[PDB]
């Protein structure tokens, strides 16, 4: 199929691997473990330490709709705007309450 042949032509035209990089030193080879994570790199250092929490009190927003929330649900710990959203919050499927806390970074773990 010409479209597939053209697609082959594109990837063959785009591929780097078929190209010899003459500027690349052929003798140099990396340490395979070099791809450390940022947590590991900091741990191996034991300035990229650069902010702190606010002391101003925090505004309250509805976990469902982001509108201002007067209310904090005791049961599910979601903040909610009104009786319509409280009703919906109490009828969420299993685990959806934690899914709303995850957007706030407040999930149970």
């Amino acid at each position: 199929q010409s479209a597939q042949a053209a697609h082959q032509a594109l990837v063959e035209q785009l591929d780097l691997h078929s190209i010899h990089k003459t500027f690349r030193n052929p003798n140099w080879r990396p340490n395979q473990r070099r791809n450390k994570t940022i947590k590991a790199i900091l741990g191996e250092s034991q300035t990229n330490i650069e902010s702190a929490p606010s002391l101003a009190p925090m505004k309250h927003y509805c976990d469902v709709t982001g509108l201002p929330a007067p209310y904090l649900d005791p049961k599910t710990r979601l903040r909610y705007h009104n009786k319509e959203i409280f009703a919906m919050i109490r009828n969420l499927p299993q685990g959806m309450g934690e899914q709303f806390l995850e957007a706030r970074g407040a999930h149970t773990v």
């Binding site: 994570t37 940022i38 300035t47 990229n48 929490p53 925090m58 709709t65 957007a103």
Partner: protein, 448 residues
């Protein structure tokens, strides 16, 4: 009555994605003129952006290349051969993509991906056996990451000299920056850096861990929650990034604009509707706040394939930019907001410094906005109003846009690249062999 019957048919915008579009042959024209340019006055300029790697020749006004820092490599089972890609050639059709940076972080971490990106950069620049290299660097880049990047440049590519500088600060000097407060919001982070006598006070810089990547991720969560019952389209972070770019804006009065945002009157104008591609073969919805939130003023039926395949952004038009100003309240980032960060610098830190002269007033006369993630509407105006309330009355506060928010850091690095100031800061290969890649020349635009 049926007020929605009065409304026009909704205007709807197609989804957009990061996509392949055009090939780029090796630009050997550039190599030829680079050899013609005067001695000691050519360099390769690499803005090492987590959103886009920008590269080109110092003697030119634009990068010749702008490429996502991604690779794709796979063994094709049918052609029997390896394929390798770096950048938009990854179509971003197997999409086995890997990214050079750690997620949401301005620091390079996949060095094999980084080498593939640089190979692509040099091939497209036409390097065919070299010029010295100017590399932009994260504001407090980790020593190990500086070490690793140096090793690749000197030992794999053999380059004669390398210098690292900070994209925020190059942008400032390109815009006649002399003393000021540099406010950068990038893909990876938001920074506020005081700059004095053209020299940055990096000891007084602050990083907010929110940026244009985090906005795309956060917008994705909010959409997957809004339609938690099920959206048929394949929601991904790349689509929401274009939604944040196209539709979000900063509020000038968040908690009063927000409190009325879902009111039915005029929600037809406040909502914006994104269409995913589809195939076709006394108490009701008109009083439901959740209907207005999810579907706007129009009635909804799940029979219409088109209407089932569209998202309504609504409150997320303003809720997403406001994370910069209210990180803990909107997204739970336990960090001070942008106005409180910049205010604490001007109010507390700089007037405490010895020998600083007229702090804050000297800095306050040029608050400067850098980086693509500042390009939201009202971003400057919001920052001005916020700072104005923290400063003695009548203080000469100015907030200023960079002339370009994304290329301008490369343009600054390119102009600086071959100056005597830069060439004093260059590290040669032999200096690298003496000192190792962790050593760096202290200079006004670079890390300590």
């Amino acid at each position: 009555d049926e007020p929605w019957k009065r409304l026009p048919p909704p205007t709807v915008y197609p989804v957009k994605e990061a996509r392949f579009e055009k090939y780029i042959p090796p630009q050997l024209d550039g190599r030829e003129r680079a050899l013609a340019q005067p001695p000691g006055q050519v360099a390769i300029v690499i803005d090492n952006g987590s959103h886009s790697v920008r590269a080109g020749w110092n003697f030119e006004d634009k990068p010749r290349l702008a490429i996502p820092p991604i690779m794709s490599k796979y063994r094709d089972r049918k052609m029997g051969k390896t394929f390798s890609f770096a950048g938009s050639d990854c179509y971003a059709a197997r999409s086995h993509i890997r990214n050079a940076f750690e997620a949401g972080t301005g620091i390079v971490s996949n060095w094999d991906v980084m080498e593939h990106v640089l190979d692509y950069v040099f091939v497209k620049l036409g390097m065919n056996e070299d010029m010295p290299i100017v590399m932009t660097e994260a504001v407090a880049n980790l020593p190990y990451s500086r070490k690793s990047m140096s090793e690749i440049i000197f030992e794999c590519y053999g380059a004669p000299s390398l210098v690292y500088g900070i994209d925020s600060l190059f942008s400032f000097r390109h815009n006649q920056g002399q003393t000021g407060l540099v406010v950068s919001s990038s893909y990876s982070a938001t920074h506020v850096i005081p700059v004095y006598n053209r020299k940055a006070l990096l000891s007084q810089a602050i990083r907010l861990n929110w940026g244009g990547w985090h906005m795309a991720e956060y917008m994705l969560k909010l959409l997957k929650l809004k339609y938690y019952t099920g959206f048929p389209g394949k929601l991904n972070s790349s689509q929401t990034e274009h939604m944040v770019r196209d539709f979000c804006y900063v509020s000038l009065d968040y908690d009063r604009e927000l409190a009325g945002y879902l009111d039915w009157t005029g929600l037809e104008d406040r909502e914006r509707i994104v269409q995913y591609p589809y195939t076709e073969e006394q108490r009701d919805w008109s009083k439901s706040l959740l209907h207005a939130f999810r579907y706007g003023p129009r009635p909804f039926d799940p029979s219409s394939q088109a209407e089932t395949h569209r998202v309504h952004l609504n409150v997320e038009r303003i809720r997403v930019p406001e994370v910069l100003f209210q990180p803990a309240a909107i997204a739970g980032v336990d960090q001070a907001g942008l106005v409180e960060i910049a205010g604490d610098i001007l109010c507390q830190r700089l007037p405490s410094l010895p020998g600083i002269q007229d702090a804050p007033d000297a800095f306050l006369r040029d608050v400067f906005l850098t980086g693509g993630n500042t390009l939201f509407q009202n971003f400057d105006e919001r920052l001005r109003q916020g700072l104005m309330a923290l400063l003695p009355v009548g203080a000469p506060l100015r907030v200023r846009r960079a002339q370009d928010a994304i290329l301008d850091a490369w343009r600054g690095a390119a102009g600086w690249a071959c100056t005597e100031e830069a060439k004093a800061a260059w590290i040669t290969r032999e200096e690298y062999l003496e000192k190792g890649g962790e050593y760096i020349k202290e200079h006004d635009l670079g890390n300590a």
